[PDB]
Write a protein that binds this ligand. Structure first.
Ligand SMILES: CC(=O)c1nc(NC(=O)[C@@H](C)NC(=N)N)sc1-c1cc(O)cc(O)c1
Ligand SMILES: CC(=O)c1nc(NC(=O)[C@@H](C)NC(=N)N)sc1-c1cc(O)cc(O)c1
Length: 130
């Protein structure tokens, strides 16, 4: 209805702002754009479901997230992909892993502080009605 697409539009506006705040953080620069296979050719073999912050923005604008849980699933995917592609003990791998866990922790912490629990519950109940 009108009340419901208004609820989803408010979610989209909130998720855009959060994603922008993540994307401007210097720690998360490596997660801002899709991987260039020219630059890591073995990535395509390893990472079956690639995800990055520009693609998250695109999915927001495409109405793909109806709940914050849908959004955090793709943040979780950015993180798990980074851990999967960078599993080794060497410092380059460890640096990316640390940034990936920090991206995840930061996104969850913003949403805990700033997204009203009743608003998320509303989003979920509309979603389950469709
Ligand atoms: C996002 C990601 O997982 C990622 N991981 C890297 N790891 C490595 O370069 C080394 C340390 N490990 C290894 N090759 N196994 S570089 C990198 C990355 C991807 C981009 O699209 C842009 C960018 O600046 C960096
Ligand atoms: C643009 C980019 O995001 C991307 N570009 C590709 N091809 C290209 O020819 C470039 C050059 S492959 C690729 C990609 C990464 C994955 O981890 C899985 C996957 O299925 C696809």
């Amino acid at each position: 209805s009108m009340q419901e697409e208004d609820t989803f539009r408010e979610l989209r506006i909130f998720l855009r702002n959060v994603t922008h705040r993540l994307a401007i953080d210097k720690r998360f620069r490596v997660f801002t754009k899709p991987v260039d296979p020219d630059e890591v050719p073995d990535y395509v073999t390893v990472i079956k479901q690639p995800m990055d912050l520009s693609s998250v923005i695109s999915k927001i604008d495409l109405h793909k997230y109806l709940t914050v849980k849908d959004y955090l699933r793709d943040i979780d995917l950015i993180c798990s992909n980074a851990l999967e592609y960078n599993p080794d003990r060497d410092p380059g791998d460890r640096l990316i892993r640390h940034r990936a866990c920090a991206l995840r922790d930061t996104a969850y912490a913003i949403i805990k502080e700033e997204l009203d629990e009743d608003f998320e519950q509303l989003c979920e109940e509309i979603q389950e009605s469709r």
